[PDB]
Swiss-Prot record:
One of its GO terms (biological process) is negative regulation of DNA-templated transcription. A motif (Nuclear localization signal) lies at residues 23-33. The modification Phosphotyrosine is found at residue 21. The lineage of its organism: Eukaryota, Metazoa, Chordata, Craniata, Vertebrata. It is found in: Cytoplasm; Nucleus. Pfam families: Lipocalin. Its main location: cytoplasm. Monomer. Homodimer. Interacts with PPARG. PANTHER family: FATTY ACID BINDING PROTEIN. This is Fatty acid-binding protein, adipocyte.
Length: 133
């Protein structure tokens, strides 16, 4: 029953500061413009110890599967090759991506009927709000 409140299909309903987050990460102009326009769904499922997170949009369809605390290699939607570890910290899914001596953290949390995603790169934070589809 790890992660029960995250499981389901979620749709993006608001975004703040996402372009600036992407700039800080190093995403190029054209990808920022097209990715920033995306209205993704996020589909989260659990089977045993394996969590799967899919992101589906007109820009890209991506999927990660992982076990909490166990590092994995990820190719991000902007084509970074990163080493990722996802843990549960006080009910928050904390996703750390490492590449080229850099690091970014993406947190997913349940707040009321929303799934709130906070993306941090150095001092820049983007907040993305999803609701059930
Ligand atoms: C949906 C899409 C492809 C625009 C997208 C692209 C990225 C980048 C480019 C890797 C920064 C990203 O981080 C996120 C996400 O962080 C968000 O919604 O905030 C995630 F992962 F939660 F879906 C979405």
């Amino acid at each position: 029953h790890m992660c029960d409140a995250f499981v389901g299909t979620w749709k993006l309903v608001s975004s703040e500061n996402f372009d600036d987050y992407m700039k800080e990460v190093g995403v190029g102009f054209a990808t920022r413009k097209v990715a920033g326009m995306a209205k993704p769904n996020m589909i989260i499922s659990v089977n045993g110890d394996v969590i799967t997170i899919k992101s589906e949009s007109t820009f890209k369809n991506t999927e990660i599967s992982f076990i909490l605390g166990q590092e994995f290699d990820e190719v991000t939607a902007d084509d970074r090759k990163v080493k990722s570890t996802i843990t549960l910290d006080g009910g928050v899914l904390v996703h750390v991506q490492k590449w080229d001596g850099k690091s970014t953290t993406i947190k997913r949390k349940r707040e009321d009927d929303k799934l709130v995603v906070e993306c941090v790169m150095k001092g820049v934070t983007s907040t993305r709000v999803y609701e059930r589809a």
